[PDB]
From Swiss-Prot, chains A, B:
Activity regulation note: Inhibited by pyridone-containing alpha-ketoamides compounds 13a and 13b. In turn, alpha-ketoamide 13b (tert-butyl (1-((S)-1-(((S)-4-(benzylamino)-3,4-dioxo-1-((S)-2-oxopyrrolidin-3-yl)butan-2-yl)amino)-3-cyclopropyl-1-oxopropan-2-yl)-2-oxo-1,2-dihydropyridin-3-yl)carbamate) inhibits SARS-CoV-2 replication in human lung cells. Inhibited ex vivo by michael acceptor inhibitor N3. Inhibited ex vivo by compound 11a and 11b.
Range within the parent protein: 3264 to 3567 of 7096
Positions of the Peptidase C30 domain: 1-304
Subunit annotation: 3CL-PRO exists as monomer and homodimer. Only the homodimer shows catalytic activity. Interacts with host FBXO22; this interaction promotes the proteasomal degradation of nsp5.
Residue location of crosslink Glycyl lysine isopeptide (Lys-Gly) (interchain with G-Cter in ubiquitin): 5, 90
The gene coding this protein: rep
Stated name of the protein: 3C-like proteinase nsp5
Function: Cleaves the C-terminus of replicase polyprotein at 11 sites. Recognizes substrates containing the core sequence [ILMVF]-Q-|-[SGACN]. Cleaves and inactivates human TRMT1, preventing tRNA guanine(26)-dimethylation of tRNAs. May cleave human NLRP1 in lung epithelial cells, thereby activating the NLRP1 inflammasome pathway. May cleave human GSDMD, triggering alternative GSDME-mediated epithelial cell death upon activation of the NLRP1 inflammasome, which may enhance the release interleukins 1B, 6, 16 and 18. Also able to bind an ADP-ribose-1''-phosphate (ADRP).
Reaction catalyzed: TSAVLQ-|-SGFRK-NH2 and SGVTFQ-|-GKFKK the two peptides corresponding to the two self-cleavage sites of the SARS 3C-like proteinase are the two most reactive peptide substrates. The enzyme exhibits a strong preference for substrates containing Gln at P1 position and Leu at P2 position
Catalytic residues (UniProt): 41 (for 3cl-pro activity), 145 (nucleophile)
Origin species: Severe acute respiratory syndrome coronavirus 2
Localization, UniProt: Host cytoplasm; Host Golgi apparatus; Host nucleus
Length: 304, 304
């Protein structure tokens, strides 16, 4: 037993991380086949980053201006292109460690693993949710851009996130591997708002189910509710409205625990209205919303 | 900015995980050079596990009774020995992916990364502290034994933990890579007590420093204290007594923030006595003690 925020093993992605330097700016790139993907603001000086004209900046750059290093070994850049907010650098060597991979645009409420990197070298790994307001709550310093987020399904790495920036609220923003930002964000150093950070209701319920699967049951009560009545309380607390598809997704955890989803909803309602009275759930004193139902099943079933 | 529980990249350890089956029992092994390390209870049937006589059970086993698989590829076992609570299986092939490595016995209060595995295949990665009562709070199912915990310093993997069992309280217990349990535990299915779970004071302070490094400062007050007076309150709350060596270890975070350690101690005292009044620190509503000072510096400096 036990329940922990758990990242995927990072080995397959470690072998894809390179360093990309353009002038004075160094960040990370993702090397897959003969292409290196990185954030386009690698072509910016610090001054340029407040209002870059990326097309104009990029025109002053040639292949030899992009220094790409895989470990100690320099890669030869033979072409470059800009796709939305990422650069694709073509190199003369296919990465021999390229895993089976896909690029995917994840949906809000889904989770993924971040391999935080500096100077092309991995620093650590942790799980994030793409929040409903299309930000993530990560750990990123100067030099971390180009770090990527991913999921693994057996053998295949689905890359879904590349890191670009931090918002004034301390949350983090980035793109899919085609260079399209999640959310309304642009890669320039202006003040930008993410909007209300609503809570992923279905994930909170999944984590309450995880708590019961793992022995924590004090919050279970004698009440039930309805979707519409629950949601009247979801709105007040800036929770996402719960839908029958959410109910179905919780099916396996509901079946597996014998607790009807709407009964658990009634437990959640009481926790929202009355707090946790100094108690804890799976070692937390807050309602946790960054575990998907799949994450709960995956962990409690030992999926590898 | 941002602060997250962060595991080391697992790639170097992934390449060392194998499957070890003895009869009906399958668990994980660690393959380094021509030796596979695994928990000795792989030789037990389910019945044997309540009161095994390991020496007697092991005498009925020969090399060919240990099936060791690296991915799809069978390894040939050419010798076996029992060292404390682990088996060393000698195989005829040196692991070509063996990293630079050390075996270390970590001290209580230090952290490490767990690569949870099933059937010799990695499932996920997460950070644990060796708690003062020599348990860890992990996520482990049937089949997870032989999963290992480790630290990396640049190129060298220091293995410090191998997983063996779960206590009735839902916490986890295991050995160093020489097979010696952390704590008073034995590998048999009896009820076993870990004792009072005291809190790692120096780590809580480090995490309060991390909170300030990352913008959370509401808990800073106008008070200071002394070591002896602080500890009078540490005892009541089952915190470890704070020592001057702890104070020195916090030196870099104290210097880096301009907050005297004893001033921060006064903040912690008030948080213990008055709770957090519904507020949060680095996204938590509890005082977090599983980050070492080193962990805080490492993360906030981008060590790779
Ligand atoms: C890429 O390495 C970097 C990551 C930032 C730096 C601190 N934490 C992060 O997530 N991105 C930028 O520096 C980004 C570049 C623009 C062209 C979008 N600018 C940015 O995030 O500005 C806000 C900021 C910068 C430096 C420190 C704190 C906030
Ligand atoms: C090794 O795979 C296994 C890991 C346990 C199983 C559930 N969670 C864990 O950490 N260890 C054992 O099964 C261990 C073997 C003895 C010879 C020490 N026995 C054990 O941990 O018993 C308690 C227990 C067993 C099964 C489910 C829940 C608790």
């Amino acid at each position: 037993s036990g329940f922990r925020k758990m990242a995927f093993p990072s080995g397959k992605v470690e072998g894809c991380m390179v360093q990309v330097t353009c002038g004075t700016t160094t960040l990370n790139g993702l090397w897959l086949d003969d292409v290196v993907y990185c954030p386009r603001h690698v072509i910016c000086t610090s001054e340029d980053m407040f209002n870059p004209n990326y097309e104009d900046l990029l025109i002053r750059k040639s292949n030899h201006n992009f220094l790409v290093q895989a470990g100690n070994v320099q890669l030869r850049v033979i072409g470059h292109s800009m796709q939305n907010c990422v650069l694709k650098l073509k190199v003369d060597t296919a990465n021999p460690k390229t895993p089976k991979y896909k690029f995917v645009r994840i949906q809000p409420g889904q989770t993924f693993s971040v391999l935080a990197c500096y100077n092309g070298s991995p620093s650590g790994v942790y799980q994030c949710a793409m929040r409903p307001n299309f930000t993530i709550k990560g750990s990123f310093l100067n030099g971390s851009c180009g770090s990527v987020g991913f999921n693994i399904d057996y053998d295949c790495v689905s890359f879904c996130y590349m890191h670009h920036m931090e918002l004034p609220t301390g949350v983090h923003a980035g793109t899919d591997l085609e260079g399209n930002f999640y959310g309304p964000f642009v890669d320039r150093q202006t003040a930008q708002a993410a909007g209300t950070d609503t809570t992923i209701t279905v994930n909170v319920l999944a984590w309450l189910y995880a708590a019961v699967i793992n022995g924590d049951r004090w919050f279970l009560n004698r009440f039930t509710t309805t979707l519409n009545d629950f949601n009247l309380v979801a709105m007040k607390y800036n929770y996402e409205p719960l839908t029958q598809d959410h109910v179905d997704i919780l099916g396996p955890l509901s079946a597996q625990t014998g607790i009807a989803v709407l009964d658990m909803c009634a437990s959640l309602k009481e926790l929202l209205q009355n707090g946790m009275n100094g108690r804890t759930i799976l070692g937390s004193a807050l309602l946790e919303d960054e575990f998907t139902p799949f994450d709960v099943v995956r962990q409690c079933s030992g999926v590898t």
